[model samples]
Target chain A: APLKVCIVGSGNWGSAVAKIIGNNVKKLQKFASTVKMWVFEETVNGRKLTDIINNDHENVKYLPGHKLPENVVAMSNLSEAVQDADLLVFVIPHQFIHRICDEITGRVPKKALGITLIKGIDEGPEGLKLISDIIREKMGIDISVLMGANIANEVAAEKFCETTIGSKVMENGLLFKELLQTPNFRITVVDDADTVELCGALKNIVAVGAGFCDGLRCGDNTKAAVIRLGLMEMIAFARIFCKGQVSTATFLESCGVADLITTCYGGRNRRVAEAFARTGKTIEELEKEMLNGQKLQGPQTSAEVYRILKQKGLLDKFPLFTAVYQICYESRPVQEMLSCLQS
Target chain B: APLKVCIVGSGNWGSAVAKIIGNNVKKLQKFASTVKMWVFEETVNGRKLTDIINNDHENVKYLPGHKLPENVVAMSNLSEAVQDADLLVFVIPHQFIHRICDEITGRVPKKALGITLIKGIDEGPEGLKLISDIIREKMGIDISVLMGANIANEVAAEKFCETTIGSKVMENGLLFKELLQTPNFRITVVDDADTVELCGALKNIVAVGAGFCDGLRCGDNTKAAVIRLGLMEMIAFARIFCKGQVSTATFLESCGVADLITTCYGGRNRRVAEAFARTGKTIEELEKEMLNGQKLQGPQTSAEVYRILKQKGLLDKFPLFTAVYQICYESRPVQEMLSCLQS
Candidate 1:
């Protein structure tokens, strides 16, 4: 039988992942005759979700040349999507993941393996933890998490990409890895969940830093220096927070450095950089535009992560982060901020 | 007497350097009233040279925004420019640097330090050597070479910039550094001439790789991977060729890793990448445009260095460079090239 899958939160990434699975639904069905998939958009009406899947807006449209797969059904109600699902995938923001989990906790099958597609750290009443940590704590259910160095646009465009999947437990890690594996998307199973979570979280900070570098118009030299320094900052923080769990090799490999670079170059975080560079707009103004706009998820999540990093005293170690934090939070002049950043 | 400084070979970098010196003529005059600065444009006629300088461009309207410093004079005659110059700055390409040196051999004043602002490796009947080595071997005179991590546009704009001047002989290094140092422009003196030249030459290879990465539209993950790999390639080559005289840390700190990020971002090489991505143009077509258009000097020179690396079988180790090389030289399909490159 094909693995019964439920993709929660049909936003950009969720829908993109859904589209990837949707486009290959026949192939997936071939592999498992009983395969089934559902998309939960977390809305009262399915109109917005339906329109997104079917709309055409220049380069922004999803699957412009293709038709929707029959196997994948979009559901507006969370209960309808989660019921009888053997695998539950959370693609929402870290802050919203717990709330959605609270609402759908009872509806999901007890045998369903939980997979977090979100890359962020959440602040709970107790303290800040990885979104995976928050999910396990709030729902009192331990589930496997999958992370791959993936950009939603590329996957939506059906470009072949490689990514890593990991769980705190090794056997469950391999199981989730097997379930998520697709021909176009390569997956590697990892046993170090803490490294995966921390690497995923800290990479956002570097992505925002890269945005600041591009915005400064300081040229290639400054950008290279920022990336090198950003790596050092990530290492310092990863060493303190994740301890021996973080691999220096991983820092250079797919999950750590790879994720940071992807976020900086073409990701939504990079769009934030473009926004800063073109208009000299404040982060709030940019975030407002992004929120109003559809594609960018990094800014809101990055803003939340930046807030947590600042509170933890970790922000002092990173100058690039501090400069970006000031601009994003304190309304610092972009030029002044850049000058300070370069110096 | 004030230093009589002569800049040889008026190309893009040469012209920009001449303009910078010309703009700061008063400062040069302050250091010495007879601060005679001469420009040797590779033109046949003195009148044509004069006309070219007078032509108006938007940012650099020769006669409008700022006139060439009164102390700085343009000349078609090489002998005239070299007449009493205390410092001969070669702003020519690496391969041409030797020929230019042979042309001016025994003509330069013994006290005048021969500084090469050029960045590339020269390979002729003799094996690979820094442009400085080629000049010293041909002229049989110890010429001080000055190179730095700087963009010509930024330097031309008079934004605060820094460079390093080096000599096998220490006193000449200090003299070269002192000659170029000003409030807005800073120069650091290093004892290792090979390190200085290697940094300049290897940076271009990395830049080309970065450009290729950008062209592929492979996100930051690919960008960072290319740079890290480029840095390692340079460091390994530097260690072998320079007998470990150049520290990897110093190279990474100086023109090493720091120099490449911008070149990849949108500097000369980066612009090339962007153009290639948009048009599916080969490197040769791009180079032809730039050479005919006089847009960049580094990439063409880099082609020679790349050829030598390929011949030496060292090019196989660099994934990014190989992708660019195959596409640029072997007429490979860009999409296929990128797929192999991403792998």
Candidate 2:
């Protein structure tokens, strides 16, 4: 039987993935041609975005200026979207992942495989939790993560970019790769699932660090050092956090260095943090006005990471991450970003 | 007896490093106060450049705007500058390394530690050569290498940046680290000398690939992908070329990733290659006009690397490097760069 896929969100990245999936499934006999996407029911210009997507094959509000494939069916109900689908792509707001995963707990087949494009972590009773683990816990499915230099809007233009997929089951990773890759969207699959996911989370943290450098008006050398230092801390923290099944090879892939390069140089994290450094405003206040409620992974993840590093007595080992956490929450000045590194 | 420190080249990077060396020696009783700098004897505005550096503590022709430390003495003769110096810092044109080494074979102390800051490779009779190895062979001295996000002009301004020093002898690396590091200029010492030197050589190839992406207006993701893949190729090449006691750890250091970042983002290689892609001019023609023959490392290293890859029957293994070489010399259009990576 052909595998039916359902996308769990209709945000910017969600629609872009739909374009790729909806197009790829059209040619492959192993994939069902219909891709169901849950849009959370939005109204833009007095028209339902889902209704517009169903009729016009365009996500006009979130991923504007890009045409999705016609075979991508959009619906407002979560249960209807995932009912019989054998593949799930969770590309939604991380803040709602828990409630959404709980809502769809018994709706999807137990055997269905899932991949997440979500970029941040969650708070566990202990401090840190993985979205993949959260989804797996609620949904009873094997999960993988896709992350890299993929900026969803740029990807929507079909510009060439590379991505890394980490799946415990190599075959599952390959299956996701087959469905998602296009002429310009390249994919590389690796066997270490957790590290790939960790790369996605820590990458945003580095971007915040990168943003402070940008805000401080540092040179490329200083800029590159902050990012590299942040990257090493990412590796160190992941090595400790993941506990087993780890290697630095995945850090060589798109998920690690490639993704960090883009996130640090150009993204909301870099944008917001740089703005935060320039304008004396609260991080939450800036998000409300600037991003207007899009979840910021960097500052949020730093809080989660800070808690864990603190609980484990590992804060001193990660100066950049500590510096970012302090600056964002403790009213520490931005100048300390470099002071923590050099002095 | 305090060790005499002599800088082997008074170019941009050479003078920046001299500032550090000259400053560091001022505070250390184990180091001589005077730092001899070998200037290749150029005239700026009808005045000798060496005279300018010697009198005004500035290499006006190569490194203006920043004052060198007063103790950094400049001389026109290479043999005189290197003579009896306990530490030699080699920063010169890779094209003249052989002739320069021949000119000063026995002038320096045989036991003096040497570090090469030269950034490209030489065409051996068999095809690839290391500048560090060349100096070691010519002068019978242990050689180390320093490379990173170092833009000489930026470093001269004391903009914060990190660098890596690779030495076969860890103690030697530490000594060099002490002499070269400053508050703004951080240094990390590694025990892999050849990989560090190879990183310095191959960094140019990656930057050219980066330029080609920028020239094509490929998205940020694609640019990062090309750079990351190029970095992977660097690791593979050095692993095979060096063949013993190599680890992926060094590739994560300032020498490998940090050096590649600055070079790829903002350097003569990226600048010239992007120009070549836009102007449809031959690479040699572009170098002559754009860089005024100051030695663009990317295009030159690709040819040398291309020859070695061809000799070893590994051309297909390195698509990006092969694609770059083809575009530069084989008359392949810049559009094929993405084509080779994607299709």
Candidate 3:
């Protein structure tokens, strides 16, 4: 029998992951003819699911006529979806992962492995552990985390992209790598979970810096400088705080460096850069723009990152960061902040 | 007396340098109540030099003008131009530098240091060293070189910028450094002449790479990949060719890395990328565009670069360089060449 997989949550990133997985049903069927996958979108909104193996339509009683993956299934009942699943992937926001994880913990099968697809660091209200750590704590189970430097729209468009999967244990990471690696989507296994988590969180800060540079019309030289310095800062923090558990140099490669570049240049980050450059607007302005058009993530993450980094004293080290934090928090003038660069 | 400086060539970069130096005349005058500087523009364009420098109509004049600077002068006559100059700054193109240097070799005074404002390998018609090497070989007198990682227009526009000067002899480099250092502008001194020259030339290649990436609309991840790899490739070549004369790691700093970033983001190199991406056009397109309206460099140096790197077997090392080379020299279809990247 093929591995049964269940994807929980239906936000922007989660929906993107579901769509891609839904599209890949045929390939999955060709490889593992019996493979079964299910998507749990809380509110069905005229999405279709077509054939691969054993797709269910009866789950969406509210929407009488909705088409979806024929071989895939959908369900509102969380317990029914998780029952007999070999793997469970949580595509929820980083903030909501703990509560969701707790909901399914009792029903999780002994053989099933839990996976996290979020990128943010979920330090609780008072300097708490990360969301992944919290999940491990609450579920009383070890879980693997997968994060990649990519724009969801591009991924959904089926563009060739790569990402990393990290787990506290090697076997767990390798499992996700094997499952996801394909011609278009390349996935690599990383044994260090903390490094993977920290890189994902730290890179958002650089995205803000990149947007700020774009706003100032400072050119690529400034953008590259911010990235190089930001990476160094991230590595320095990891070394000191994480006790050198992660390799600093590896961040320049596909997974680590790749994530930093994509987020800085693509999707929400690029939009943020454009917004900031044009209007000297805050993240709120960006959110309003997104509401009128489509949503973006990196800009929303910017203010939060600014706050967290400031609280941790990490913002003091980088002048670039300090400037960005001042812009986001202290409401400093953009041009004045830029002028302060060389000074 | 103020330091006497003569700049050869009057190309785009050369003219811009002349303009910046012109802006410095007020301070230069303070250095010696009667400041002496000569601009050698072979062609007379409609561009105004009067607005750039103040109260210097008597001090500044057209080439081959009747009377010269008691302090400052302008002359098209090569021998007269080089006469009694404290410093000979070559702002000529890479190809023209050798010919100009060969012509001026014997005329250079004994203690007069030749500072190259040119940025690129000589790539002479036949077997020949760089302009600096060729100058020393022919003149039988070694001259120190001062080069900076600066976009001339930005420098001319009074944008805050940094520059580096280097020489085989420490005092020689410092002499030029002291002459150019101003309040808004920075000049760093280096012992490695080869490092300074190579960084200046190799950076153009990176500018082209960045242009191509920008043109192709390669996402941030891809651009970052191109930049990091391009940097590494340039560093490797410099390390191998210079043979401990320069450090691979040093280029990652402001002068090296910062310069490359500026080139890629919104400079001449970026314009090249924009044009190339739009129409798969040559650098001649960039030249035409500049002639039409946009002010950015687009003259082709790709063929020369490929000819050198191909012979040296370094083509396989850089994808950005490889793509640009094929588009530039091999007349490869831009789409096919870009598609090769996905593969």
Candidate 4:
């Protein structure tokens, strides 16, 4: 029996992955021909976004200009999308995972597998929590994660890139690789799912530091130093946060350094953070002006990470992360970011 | 008896290190206060460069504006500069290493320690040879190497950065770290001398590919992919090329990934190679026009790497390196640079 696949998000990145899965599923016999994509209902240009995606076979509001494959059907109903999906791809924003997983709690198959394409984390009662854990707890499914230096528009253009899929089950890892990997979009599977996921979330804080370097006109060498130090802290924090073995070699993977380079150089977090430094503006002001009311992930993640670091008395250990949080919120001098590194 | 220090080659980087050594040697009781710096005799404005440096207390031609410590005495005569020197710092271009070592042959003490700050490799009859090996063979002295994400001007400006000193002897590694490491200029000592030197050289080839990505205006994700793939090839090549064990963790050090990032983002090889792709100019033409005839190390190293890969029949294993060679020398389409990764 063929396994049914559903992608539970239809934003820019979600649509981009849908284009890949929609075509990849047709070539792989283990997966069903039709792939369901769950999109939160929204009206764009006076037309329903889900309806437009279904009729036009394109995500006009989110991933403009790219045509999604016809086999990828759009769904507004959460439970209906995951009705019998044997493989679930969680690609929505990190905040929506809990509610969506709650909605799909008893609807999906008991043996369904999951892969998270989400790139942020949540603040748990204790400290940082993985979104994959959230989905797994709510829906009772084994979850893996996919992350890389992937930008949705570039992936949609089929530009060459590589990604990592982390799964505890080698069989499931290979299966997801089969469904996700393409000629231009290469995939490497690994066993450290938690580390890979953590890298995706932690890199935003580093990117913010990189932005401060850029904003301060710190030369290329200084910026590179900041990026490397941020990576060291990420590795350090992950060792404390992750339950599994977190190797330094894993941080060399696409999920770790590659994604970091992309975010530091091109992501919205870096851009807005740069603006915050240059204009002496608050993150809130920049979020409204730069992101059109959408929140920036770096500052929020820094707060969560700061809380955990403080709780464990590890705040002094991660200077770059601590300086970022302090500089962003506590009105610490921007130059202190670089000063922290020297200490 | 205190160890006397002589800096051979008073270029920008050499002078920068001289500043650090001059200040640092004073604090360490095991080191001499007066450090001799050997400068190639040249006329800057009508006066000899060596004489100007001695009188003005600065290398005005190479490292202007920054004042050298009074104890860093500049000498035009190589023999006089190195006489009785127990410590030698080689910081010249790769091409001049053999000739300079020949000049110092049987001159320094047999127990003298040396560290090469040179970053590129030379083509031997085999394929590639370390500059330190040439110095060791010619001068009959033990050689270590220092390489990292260091830009000389930034270091001279006292900006914070990290570097790696690779020495086979743990004692020598610690000694060099003591002599060189400062608050702003941090050092990590590793026993993998060969891999460290190889990374310093091989990174140029990767930087050339990074330049092609920038030339094509490929987005950040694709560029990051190129950098990461380039790093993977550097690690693979080091494993095959080095005589000792080459762990991937070492590549995570300042010598490997940190240095690679700085080169790909800010070095002349990446800058010139970008012009090569965008303007369709020859590497030689760009060198003449942009670099004032100074050789670009990336293409030269690519030719050496290609010779070795072809000899080993391992050309197919390194697509990024091969693509860089072909694109630079064989007139392959620039687009093929990105296409090579898809394979």
Candidate 5:
């Protein structure tokens, strides 16, 4: 029998992926036509979001105006969503991964494979933990990751962009590529799964540094220096953080460099961080003002990364990451962001 | 017994480099304090530019407002400038490289080592040839290169930036590093001389594509995608162009990705190309209006790259490069730049 597919979230990014996966599976004969999308139970306009998606074929709340394909079924129950799925796409917010995985533990088929479109990290007892590792540990399945300079609405609009899929298994990587790749949404698969996933989490910190450059009105040369140094530090931290061998070439992938370019230029992390530098406001204040109380990922990730660096007594090794945390929390002068990189 | 130095070009970049070389040599015991900067004997305000720089300690015609150091003596005669030199810094415009090398043939010490700060390619009988190779062949000297996200005025202003030096000899690379590196001007040395030099030439082409995106209002994601994909094609073209091993890690250095970022965001190539897309004006017309009759480098380089790719039957392999050439020359629609990358 052909493989069955399910998507485990329905936020802006999740709904966007649903638009792709919903269309992809229909064209590829190795996959089932109907795909399941597990939505966090919520009400929009006094009606269930799942009902709106299933009936109207649109994610009216998070990804408004973009219609989900007709065959993409939306479910609020996690168990029912993965009941027959052989290929699982975990596209939820990072905070919900552990809880959703716990609810689905011992429920997914033993042979099922997974791919994460989530873009942040979790703090484990040891330090930073990959969300994929968390899913692999909880659901007992091999997991891959998808990341790039992808902005959801643009991808949904079929604008041209490339993304990376890092899978430990080549066959699984190619299969996911077939299911996800579109003409405008290009894909390149690599074996450095940990580095790919780590880049997704780590880039926000670098984007924050880029924001500090912007805030200071440092010219293009200085800003480029900050971005490049942050990338170097990301590679260094990955060498210590990842369990497997990390190649510098993997950082060239869309997940590493491309996503970083996107986030530094366009994302809220850079945007809010720039505000923090300019206004001398705390990240919390900006998050409340700019994001409507949604937490900014760069400052939060820097805190987690800073804690790990401190515990390891390697704070000096990651000046950019450390500076972002100190500036965000400890009230270190924002001017030190560029100086820190110089050291 | 100390090594003597002569800079064979006194344009803005050459003058900027002379500032570093002058101050750096003063501190290091292995080099002479005095440096010779060759000017092309032009008249500024009806006075000899070389005489003004020699007497007033500044290149008033080119890099005005920044004082050239006391020890950086300016001279117009190339042979006299390079007569006693043990090191040469080549920083002239690309078209002047061959003629200058021809003028200095067999005049400098046989042991003299050289580095090129020039960033464009020349049209050889075979298609595209590196400026460094042209110098090495013409001067019979081993050549290294210095390129990065460096803007001459910012470097002269002592703003913080990073640069890459590509050298085959570790000793020569270290020597140039000692001569050029400052606290604000950091340097990284790599072995991929050809790849580093190629990045400097090819990045202008990519910046043009980025300008097209900007002109079209393609949003942040699409622009980032164009920049990153252009980087990928640069690496691919380098793999074919460089005679030595080319690692992606080298591209991560300041010369490759860093330089590309700076150029795409801030350079005239991107600026003019954006205007070309928005106004639907011919590049020649825009060049005359915006650049004071100076030709744009990106379109010229694209023409050279197109000829080479066509001859090699590898045009299809480089969508970004090919599209740049066609769009600039054949009246291909600017909108096709993004769609070509999608394929």
Candidate 6:
């Protein structure tokens, strides 16, 4: 049977991805010709956003100037959008995954496969948890993750790039690889799914460190050491946190180092962290000022990782992770970022 | 039984290193208080450069505005510099290594240990050669390599940074580590000596690929992919080219990923390659224009790698390395850089 595909969110990354999947599904025999994209129906110029998408074929607000394939049908209703989706490509923010998964849990097909392009983790009373785990638990579906250096605006422009699909199920990974791979957009499949998702969240902590270093006028040598040390912690934390075999080779993948390079040097995490460092403002204050009240992942993720490392009695083991947490929340000076590595 | 140190070069990087070692040795009881720095005979400002360094305690030409330690003696005669030395630090250009080794081939003490701070490989009629191997074969001594994100100017400024020492002889590695490490400059010792040296050499090739991507307006996504793919090839190439066990963990050290990041974003290799891509001039033209006719390690190293990979029937196995060689030597368009990764 042809795979019934549904993209569960429609923001910047979502719309850009829809542009690729919409064009991709039509050419492949295994996918249903139309890719159902669930947009949080809203108003654009006093018109229904879904109506604008359905007729104009462009995500005018989020991904302006790029034509999403006409074959991608836009619908406002979440339940109907994912009614029979055999492969669910989740591109929503991490904060909304739980409630959205709840709404579509009973509606999704029994055999639906889940893949997340969401680049964050969820926090709870128990501790931090992977977004893929949240979906697997809520919807009872086999989940995979896609991550890389894919900036939505550039990706929408059809620029050359690469991505990684990580699945515990190797065949599912390869299947998603087939669906997502393109001439300009390449894909590599890996079996280290847990480590892959963790990399997406953990790299933000490293990026925040880089921003602090940049703010302090530390030379590139010091900044590079901070970034590399944070990467070592990312690999170390994965070995302790992941249930499956966390191969070191995965850190060499697009999801790992490539995404990390972009984030540390050019992502929102680095940008806002630099602002926080320069202005001496609270992270939430900068969040409001720079991102219009959107949450920053690095600071929050550092808190979660700090708590976990504390629980494991491993706080001393990861100096970079501990330093970021201290500098962000404990009111430690940003200068301490490099000092913590000395010992 | 104090270790007598001989620094074989006094250029920019060499002078910067001499500053650190000179300061470090005075504190460590196992090292002699005075350091010997061999200066290539030259006259600057109508004064013998060595005379100024020996009396004024500064390399006024290469590293002005900084004072060298009073205990670091300067000598233009290479044979005299190494005559009674117990530890040999090779810090010269790779091109001058053979001649320097020949000059001091039998002059140094038999128990002396060698550590190279040099960062390039050599080519022979057969294939490529490691700089450490060049020193070992010519001088008949145990050898090690030190590489990292330590740019010379920043180190001279006393900015915080980290480096790695790769030694087959772990204790000698530790000995050098003790002699060199300071609070501002840190070091880690690794047993994977060959991979460490190779990382320093191969990263230049990757930086060239990144420059080409940046020249073509490929954005951060494509540039990050090129760098990451280049790193993947770096790790894979090391596994094939090394003699001992090559751990993936070592690449996370300063010598590997950290150094590569600096090179790709800010090094001379990327700078010249970008000029090559934009102007359509031969690499040598830009080498002279941008680098004052100094040979670039990337274009030359790629030819060595291409030859070795071809001899081993592994050209197809390394797309990034091969692409760099093609664009540099075979007149392929820079656009072929990302395109070759597709298949």
* lDDT digits (tens) for residues A70-127 of candidate 6: 9999999998888878889999877788889888777888888989988877888766
C-alpha lDDT of candidate 2 relative to the true structure: 0.87
Q: Give fnat of each prediction, in order.
A: 0.25, 0.85, 0.23, 0.60, 0.67, 0.85
List RMSD in Å for every model shown: 5.7, 2.0, 6.3, 3.2, 3.8, 2.6
lDDT per residue for candidate 6 within B1-343, as digits (tens), equals 8889989998878999999999999998999999999998888889998999988888888788899999999987888889899998988777788888877788888888989988778886766689899899888889989999987878999989999999888999999999999988899998889888999989889989999888888887887888788888998898887876788888898999999887787777888988888899888888777764334778888888998999989998998999999999998888888787676
Question: Which candidate has the top score in TM-score?
Answer: 2
lDDT value, residue A35 of candidate 4: 97
Regions more than 4 Å wrong, model 2: B55-57
* Model 6 alpha-carbon drift over 4 Å, by segment: A42-61, A64-67, A125-127, A292-295, B42-67, B70-73, B125-128, B292-295
Interface root-mean-square deviation, each candidate? 4.3, 0.9, 3.7, 1.8, 1.9, 1.6
**Candidate 3, residues A183-217: lDDT per residue as tens digits?**
55666676777777777776776777677667766
- Sorted into a CAPRI-style docking class, model 3 comes out as acceptable
Residue A172 CA displacement from its true place in model 1, Å: 7.2
All candidates: DockQ: 0.21, 0.80, 0.26, 0.56, 0.54, 0.69
Give the higher-lDDT candidate: 1 or 6: 6
Question: Which candidate, 2 or 5, would have the higher TM-score against the true structure?
Answer: 2
Residue clash pairs of candidate 2: none
Query: Candidate 5's residue-wise lDDT over A1-343, tens digit each?
Result: 8789999988878889999998988988899999989988788889998899999999887788998899999998889999878999998877778889889999989999999988888897755788888898888998998989897878888777789999999899999999999988899999888889999999999999899889987778987888788899999999898887888888888888888888887788888989988998778788788874234678778888998889899998888899989988898999998789677
For model 5, the superposed segments whose C-alpha errors exceed 4 Å read A1-5, A22-36, A41-61, A64-87, A107-112, A293-295, B1-7, B10-12, B18-87, B104-113, B125-128, B140-142, B169-171, B293-295
User: Lowest lDDT 10-mer window, candidate 5 chain A?
Assistant: A291-300
Candidate 6, residue A99: lDDT: 86
Worst 10 residues of 1 chain A by lDDT: A54-63
TM-score of chain B as predicted in candidate 3: 0.80
Query: Order of all candidates by TM-score, from best down to worst?
Result: 2, 6, 4, 5, 3, 1
Candidate 1 residue B269 C-alpha distance from true site, Å: 4.3
